[PDB]
Design a protein around this ligand. Sequence first.
Ligand SMILES: OC[C@H]1O[C@@H](O[C@@H]2[C@@H](O)[C@H](O[C@@H]3[C@@H](O)[C@H](O[C@@H]4[C@@H](O)[C@H](O)O[C@H](CO)[C@H]4O)O[C@H](CO)[C@H]3O)O[C@H](CO)[C@H]2O)[C@H](O)[C@@H](O)[C@@H]1O
Ligand code: XKP
Ligand code: C14
Ligand code: D12
Ligand code: D12
Ligand code: D12
Ligand code: D10
Ligand code: D10
Ligand code: D10
Ligand code: D10
Ligand code: D10
Ligand code: D10
Ligand code: DD9
Ligand code: DD9
Ligand code: DD9
Ligand code: DD9
Ligand code: DD9
Ligand code: DD9
Ligand code: DD9
Ligand code: HP6
Ligand code: HP6
Ligand code: HP6
Ligand code: HP6
Ligand code: HP6
Ligand code: HP6
Ligand code: HP6
Length: 1503
Amino acid sequence: EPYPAWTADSQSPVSIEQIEDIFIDLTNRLGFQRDSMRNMFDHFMVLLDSRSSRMSPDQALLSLHADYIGGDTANYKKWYFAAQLDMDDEIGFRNMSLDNSLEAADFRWKAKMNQLSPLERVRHIALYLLCWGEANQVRFTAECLCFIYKCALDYLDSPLCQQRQEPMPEGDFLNRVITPIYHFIRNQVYEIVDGRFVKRERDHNKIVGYDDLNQLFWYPEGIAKIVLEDGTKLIELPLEERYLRLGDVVWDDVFFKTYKETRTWLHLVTNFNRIWVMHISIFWMYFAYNSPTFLAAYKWASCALGGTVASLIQIVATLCEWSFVPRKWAGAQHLSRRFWFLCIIFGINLGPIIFVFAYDKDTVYSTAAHVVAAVMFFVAVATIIFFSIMPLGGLFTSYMKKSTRRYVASQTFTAAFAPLHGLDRWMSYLVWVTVFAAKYSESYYFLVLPLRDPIRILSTTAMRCTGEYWWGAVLCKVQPKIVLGLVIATDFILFFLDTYLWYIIVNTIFSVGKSFYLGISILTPWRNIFTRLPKRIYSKILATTDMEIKYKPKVLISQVWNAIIISMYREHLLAIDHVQKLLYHQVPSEIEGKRTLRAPTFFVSTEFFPRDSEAERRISFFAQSLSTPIPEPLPVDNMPTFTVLTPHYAERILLSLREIIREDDQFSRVTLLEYLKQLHPVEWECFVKDTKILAEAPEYTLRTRIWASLRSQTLYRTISGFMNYSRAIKLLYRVENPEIVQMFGGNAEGLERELEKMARRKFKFLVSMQRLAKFKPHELENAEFLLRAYPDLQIAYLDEEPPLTEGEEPRIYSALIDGHCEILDNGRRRPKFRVQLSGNPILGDGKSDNQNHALIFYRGEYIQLIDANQDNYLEECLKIRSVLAEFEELNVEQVNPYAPGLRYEEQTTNHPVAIVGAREYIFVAAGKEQTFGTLFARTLSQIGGKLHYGHPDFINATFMTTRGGVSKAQKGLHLNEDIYAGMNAMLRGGRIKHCEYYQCGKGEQMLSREYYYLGTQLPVDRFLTFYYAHPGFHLNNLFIQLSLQMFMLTLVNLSSLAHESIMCIYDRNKPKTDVLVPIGCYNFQPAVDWVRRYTLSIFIVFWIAFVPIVVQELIERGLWKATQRFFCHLLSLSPMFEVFAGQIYSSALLSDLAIPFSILYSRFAGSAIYMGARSMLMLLFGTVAHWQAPLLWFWASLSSLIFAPFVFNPHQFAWEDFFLDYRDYIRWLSRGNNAHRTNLIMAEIIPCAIYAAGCFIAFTFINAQTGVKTTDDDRVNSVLRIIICTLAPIAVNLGVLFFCMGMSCCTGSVMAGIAHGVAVIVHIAFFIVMWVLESFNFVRMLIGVVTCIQCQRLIFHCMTALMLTRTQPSRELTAKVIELSEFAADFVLGHVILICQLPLIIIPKIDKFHSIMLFWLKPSRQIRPPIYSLKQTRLRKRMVKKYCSLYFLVLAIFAGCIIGPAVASAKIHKHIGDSLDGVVHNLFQPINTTNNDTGSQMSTYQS
Ligand SMILES: OC[C@H]1O[C@@H](O[C@@H]2[C@@H](O)[C@H](O[C@@H]3[C@@H](O)[C@H](O[C@@H]4[C@@H](O)[C@H](O)O[C@H](CO)[C@H]4O)O[C@H](CO)[C@H]3O)O[C@H](CO)[C@H]2O)[C@H](O)[C@@H](O)[C@@H]1O
Ligand SMILES: CCCCCCCCCC(=O)O[C@H](COC(=O)CCCCCCC)COP(=O)(O)OCCN
Ligand SMILES: CCCCCCCCCCCCCC
Ligand SMILES: CCCCCCCCCCCC
Ligand SMILES: CCCCCCCCCCCC
Ligand SMILES: CCCCCCCCCCCC
Ligand SMILES: CCCCCCCCCC
Ligand SMILES: CCCCCCCCCC
Ligand SMILES: CCCCCCCCCC
Ligand SMILES: CCCCCCCCCC
Ligand SMILES: CCCCCCCCCC
Ligand SMILES: CCCCCCCCCC
Ligand SMILES: CCCCCCCCC
Ligand SMILES: CCCCCCCCC
Ligand SMILES: CCCCCCCCC
Ligand SMILES: CCCCCCCCC
Ligand SMILES: CCCCCCCCC
Ligand SMILES: CCCCCCCCC
Ligand SMILES: CCCCCCCCC
Ligand SMILES: CCCCCCC
Ligand SMILES: CCCCCCC
Ligand SMILES: CCCCCCC
Ligand SMILES: CCCCCCC
Ligand SMILES: CCCCCCC
Ligand SMILES: CCCCCCC
Ligand SMILES: CCCCCCC
């Protein structure tokens, strides 16, 4: 018997016979495929059965007609009111507010659909379904389908076609109006070569995709660009004669690009322009206030000048946005009409300032110069507030004239955000008001106020040196100012980290506080969740409130709790003597003889679960998750149907048999069977017990296959353990209604058949086996076994068939095979349906296409789309009637969507819910426990919303199918393949909520076109919430790294200034003896104290935003480790010990986010090492020149970043694997061998030149002698040293290369060997010559080496960029030179690293310790080869002993290169060399001069 909720009622308007005739009529008179008509007829009736199972059929049909075409929710009405009768701006106006006109048409539409007959509505819905089920891959472009549907309906509703009596040929709709569009889509890629298709290589800015292809149908002036074959526009023809000529149009003169994304940094200035306005514009005022050194009017005038900057960003953003949209495409006049209103505000804000600034000096105008400057400070505060609110894409729009288009993007498909009202609307303002209040309040007292003394000191004090030779002392006189500039600049980036710092705190405080105020899970009443289980199971899993005959509320709970436990036992998770204490036992009544129900001892108040196993983990969560409020479920006779999708490219259905044993000692450990036995050694015993009991053969082989496949990672386990929905639905049905059992008691087969029939009508499984036609003969047997095991599965695959005639592409179908179909002699089943596609439906590279070709067969109302590896245990598979109630449609009352009056302000179902994610974060003794809970909460709140925006689990099919698909992938767009659907269903109108009582079971997109639609149009609270989660987290990790390279550049300048000064001794209590006791000195102690207050605040932002993830990634073990650490540090150094222990976290994180030395070192060089060395030399110079106390907190961090990958290797430190690794390293080193274009050159040259000038300036000043009291004609001429020590090694390399080329002209291994040998030695010797030139002074030599390295790097980069921007011998010279120079660095830098491990090998036994530590870290299927005989042992010892001598000789050479000048610095006691006229005092003039010219001396000049 057929669909029983529509066909078996006496109130349905139309019968199935009158429904099938309509589907046959349209097929006959339009040419739809016969197998697609038979498919959509079943999909339309299943969808009408379920929705009519909880209401009346007369209302079910109306609700279906109001959700596909015609209601306020349907996408067709929204397209009709926006691209067929204009009226796009009147929709944006209404949304902002929350004869022609708008009501005069909305009322007409609403009163026209109200007088339709039930037999006339079916004809409307079927026409949409038949088009949607056949237009392949045009489903990604929703609007094309609406246009085609309108054309077809117009043709069918004209009286002319009625007289014609010959029907269109079959397969016409596909070969005539759908195939040209697909041919256009495919040809934008995949150029044809001689025989096949290959990926055409072209710039990713001339490739139109689906987003550009469907965007043409949003405007009436976009629809009017369709040109036919002959040349005329398509609008000329009448409405009725427009469908026939729809195959003549050429889709190549009609489609354009419409976004055209540019460079990356040009997008961030115009998308998030409300973050650069409320930070920079206030950082200006804060400093301009307390900086009098550049009266009282000038103070307010210079503070109010910060309203000009708050408008300059708003001008430079509109100017950048001018280069995204096309020229004349709708939404361009608004840019030009807004650029001329921004200039007026800029002019007004800059006007009176020019007056007040330069018209005040000692004239009679003080009366009218303070009033004009006090009002500008209040005008330039209105501008800052008005530009931090009021989205960029929507301001100055009320005042605009009619024009044509008022907005820049469509306000009905790009901006329809759900209002989010209720209580969250009020709790969303508070979170941001408090955050910004706290940030702006404490960022002024601890970051800007204590910086007003160094500003006054450093801006006035002047130096006295001799100076250089080409520019005298003009550069050494203004040093303090150069230091002050860098100090402010590096404190402008630390102003952006603070606001992300406060967002973490104020978002955890609210979560904890509200979860306490709601009283859910207060403290931890652990013996309460188990205490009251039955009352919760009787009201949250059974729908008894509408079942009546209230009787025996314990037998039902008994049945449910017995089944849930017996299943766990059957999975071999509990012992047989263990389940007896954990089950509802029934015992006969000794009083009379009747029956009695008992309860478990576990369950009223002893190894209840074995050693905190998976059984404990599951029964804990199941009982703990019923506390949270859960909506009341419906009876199992009224729940809607649903479906499960799963893709499959190439996975393993089963373990085979050769793969289970194989060979043992050729990989890790032994055979996989014994591996699994060792991993889980109790259920193997349960399995063998059951096998013996059954045996009380190949089938044993099959059972072993099954037992292995349920473990490891296959596709059979997902299907086997994910089909528990069927068992749950049968169990709930039989438990709920007992009368059905008694009517035919004694017929177990009949009862089973009834239950199966009911549970087969409410759950469908669908797996999309792509490329099933070309499986191997062994691989197809597993697929054939799946259908035999479960005779209700459904598979969809891509068939194929030879072309009709030679020369054309083959025709490929799309087929579905069930498990109840009859088998053929070929060994394959007859497909139930076969729909012809229009070509290879795979053009991308993701899984989107595979999900798309099989989305036709999705019968139901909701979809759970899963991955290829899921668990979904049975206990969490029982509350499926409650998670489907999040889609709040099950308990409502229908209100006849079409009705007179009731305008669109007082409706309720306006924003339906689209996606429903699942709960993804899986979890003084009392004080320690509370602190641990708070730390876990803080760790969760980091990803409480970060990874939870659009991760989809359930999908509203009706909503997310008529507009786009379930997910999209293309070469053009690139979001995440998984975050696109959730971020695109939010700005079409839908909502996104998520349940928290369900276990799931599991930048390059800054250039997207949806960040542009979101960050330019969202309201303020929503924009801040969106920004500080996805883009803000990625953009924060770039500021932390950028604010640690600006610090090393100011430390060098500020420590090269404290090394040549007297410093005016200063006490930090009350140093107001304003005589500056060393008399004549200049005090820099407050400036030097700034370093102490920066290291303190750069580690707070580290111990709150990077350490809490150690809990997440170390929750494996560490409770006992923490207990042991507390025991071993109960009376230790306390804070000092904790601080020193706060260094292993960086190493752990680095190694976790991170083996031969060659590969290990080459994988990290260029990302953490090449920067580490250059940032370590600078720190060494800084810590040698002045040695501030809080500077060794950087040494640990920089030393634990380049030593982490080399400490967590399995076997490295023993004695000889090290030397074999060294052998391999040496061999590899010997044979290693490694305005449209003005942005490429400046992308990587400007920051590499500023960083070089910053070091050159610091190097010149330390040589420029100060306080020396000499004559003018001394100077130092220190510039020439840099030129000598920079370009000379390049000259030597080039000369050697030329000489060796000539010698080859008149066995290249020796060539390379000698070249490398001289290249290393030249750099090592010119390291020494720079030390010699500075008269053997270490401190003023380190800064000479660093600047030489920087200048060489700059030269190489610029030369490479030039030689590739703009001759072949020149190329083969420059490339070789660059490689030969970089080889010396690659030979020195790593080789030093490998020397520092020398003292860590002399330990008599270290490998045992290291192995113990790494094994505690994790075991990984260990292995140890005992393959050792005399011959190779002798060879091993020979080679190991032979290379140790070279390893301890290179170390001696390096040590003798350093100790030499350190002992040769004593014998020499005079100046070295005397020259004149441009090289005078070339080496370094002073040998015994002093720089302490302080004391009673009253007036001296010493120029
Ligand atoms: O790229 C995608 C993935 O990015 C992952 O995050 C890493 C990010 O951690 C890395 O930044 C580090 C810096 O953190 C490090 O500076 C240290 C500070 O973090 C700390 O607070 O203070 C010490 C003081 O010594 C600093 O050294 O410096 C290194 C040096 O390069 C940076 O790498 O940057 C990576 C590339 O930008 C980035 O990938 C993220 O966790 C993943 O989720 C993401 O997929
Ligand atoms: C005194 C001895 C050393 C002489 C060093 C000669 C460098 C000669 C020039 C060069 O090689 O400079 C850089 C490499 O700098 C470095 O190794 C700096 C670290 C040096 C540590 C020395 C410790 C004693 C090239 O960097 P890249 O262009 O590779 O960076 C972009 C990514 N590819
Ligand atoms: C007003 C603030 C200006 C900030 C400019 C920052 C420039 C940084 C240049 C150096 C970056 C690191 C180069 C290795
Ligand atoms: C009743 C009006 C409430 C307005 C709330 C605005 C919140 C703005 C937060 C960010 C300010 C910079
Ligand atoms: C009159 C002397 C003015 C000197 C200004 C120096 C500014 C340095 C800015 C550095 C930014 C990275
Ligand atoms: C009036 C003298 C100006 C001297 C040149 C200053 C250049 C500053 C560049 C700073 C780079 C970090
Ligand atoms: C001050 C912010 C202006 C935009 C900064 C962009 C940083 C990333 C560039 C790649
Ligand atoms: C925008 C310039 C405003 C000039 C005001 C002058 C006032 C003069 C009062 C005597
Ligand atoms: C929420 C705190 C707002 C500012 C409180 C007062 C700060 C000090 C004013 C003197
Ligand atoms: C809400 C945090 C406010 C912090 C105020 C810091 C200054 C306290 C008074 C000096
Ligand atoms: C002169 C002070 C030196 C302090 C130690 C510098 C080297 C530290 C290596 C960890
Ligand atoms: C952990 C290493 C500590 C080194 C201290 C160096 C002190 C130098 C004082 C001049
Ligand atoms: C001295 C600073 C006063 C306040 C500046 C404007 C703050 C706007 C939120
Ligand atoms: C500082 C102003 C930059 C403006 C860039 C305009 C780019 C147009 C292609
Ligand atoms: C003494 C009269 C001063 C009036 C100032 C008016 C300023 C208007 C912007
Ligand atoms: C001399 C002090 C004048 C202060 C004027 C304040 C005006 C506020 C709108
Ligand atoms: C001088 C103290 C200024 C404090 C400003 C607080 C602003 C809160 C929005
Ligand atoms: C960036 C936050 C700095 C917080 C400093 C607090 C200092 C307390 C003594
Ligand atoms: C203000 C944005 C541009 C900054 C200079 C160019 C940076 C290129 C990496
Ligand atoms: C801090 C900006 C100063 C502007 C006035 C300079 C004369
Ligand atoms: C534009 C800010 C400075 C004005 C100076 C006028 C002399
Ligand atoms: C001196 C008071 C400091 C309070 C800090 C609160 C975060
Ligand atoms: C005469 C000035 C020469 C400057 C050279 C800078 C590298
Ligand atoms: C005194 C001139 C300005 C110095 C600071 C610029 C950031
Ligand atoms: C905030 C400006 C950053 C410029 C340098 C980017 C590498
Ligand atoms: C005459 C001033 C020259 C400055 C050079 C800075 C690199």
